[PDB]
Amino acid sequence: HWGYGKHNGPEHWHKDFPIAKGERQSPVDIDTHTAKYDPSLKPLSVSYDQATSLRILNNGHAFNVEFDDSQDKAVLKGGPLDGTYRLIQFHFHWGSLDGQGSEHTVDKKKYAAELHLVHWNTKYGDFGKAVQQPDGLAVLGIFLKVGSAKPGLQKVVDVLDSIKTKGKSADFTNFDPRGLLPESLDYWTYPGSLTTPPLLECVTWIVLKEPISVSSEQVLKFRKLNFNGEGEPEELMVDNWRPAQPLKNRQIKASFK
Ligand SMILES: CC(=O)Nc1cccc(CN)c1
Numbered sequence: 001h002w003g004y005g006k007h008n009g010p011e012h013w014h015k016d017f018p019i020a021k022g023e024r025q026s027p028v029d030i031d032t033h034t035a036k037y038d039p040s041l042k043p044l045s046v047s048y049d050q051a052t053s054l055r056i057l058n059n060g061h062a063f064n065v066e067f068d069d070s071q072d073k074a075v076l077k078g079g080p081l082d083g084t085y086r087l088i089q090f091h092f093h094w095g096s097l098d099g100q101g102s103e104h105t106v107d108k109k110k111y112a113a114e115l116h117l118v119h120w121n122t123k124y125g126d127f128g129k130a131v132q133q134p135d136g137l138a139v140l141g142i143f144l145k146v147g148s149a150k151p152g153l154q155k156v157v158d159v160l161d162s163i164k165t166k167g168k169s170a171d172f173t174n175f176d177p178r179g180l181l182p183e184s185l186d187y188w189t190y191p192g193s194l195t196t197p198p199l200l201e202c203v204t205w206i207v208l209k210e211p212i213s214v215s216s217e218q219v220l221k222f223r224k225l226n227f228n229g230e231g232e233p234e235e236l237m238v239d240n241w242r243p244a245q246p247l248k249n250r251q252i253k254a255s256f257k
């Protein structure tokens with residue numbers, strides 16, 4: 001099964017998922033000097049005040065905080081998007097060391113981790129139908145650097161002990177994802193894909209320019225999770241990131257000058 005090891009990692013994924021070599025794969029390096037300011041891009045509209053988080057799950061590849069997406073409770077619109085995209089889950093990618101972990105890079109710089117808030121386009125009715133469409137998903141990507149602690153992340157950190165191994169979940173209600181955002185909503189955007197198998201080319205990426213700061217202790221606790229299930233040999237959940245892929249025939253646009 002696919003994973004992040006030498007024998008099943010990103011360089012192997014194309015054998016079962018040929019789209020891994022497709023025309024709009026993610027992540028990419030964001031070359032800041034060649035991205036283009038687009039004054040027709042609108043401000044991002046993040047409406048999370050009514051979000052209903054439900055559960056946190058170790059799926060063997062990351063941990064997902066899942067939301068009730070049966071109504072327009074936590075939605076992303078504006079920016080490059082047409083219509084309304086509902087939040088379904090967020091997760092992170094991170095490194096074994098502070099110098100790596102992000103999927104997108106900025107002028108080749110790697111951050112310690114990257115947060116993905118995954119949303120689906122409500123005009124397709126459900127996530128499963130949305131991922132059959134080229135505009136089915138919108139992912140808000142946020143870089144993490146190590147410095148001061150992020151208070152709004154601590155509730156996530158302190159439940160991880162209860163979902164150490166693949167397949168474990170815990171109730172995770174009343175979590176406010178607004179506490180994971182930076183101050184500015186200035187962003188880059190480009191058309192891409194999910195960064196995990198099945199690597200579907202459905203995503204409008206919206207990558208925020210401003211990182212959030214998290215403490216060394218917070219990201220250290222991410223690294224105590226396990227890829228394996230209970231009762232199996234322990235494999236620390238670290239370096240669960242896909243490296244940058246060829247940009248090919250795509251333009252990265254900036255919302256700011
Ligand atoms: C596997 C899967 O579909 N999970 C999921 C996560 C969060 C919400 C929902 C309901 N749309 C489903």
Ligand SMILES: [Zn+2]
Pocket residue numbers: 091092093116195
């Ligand atoms: Zn992701």
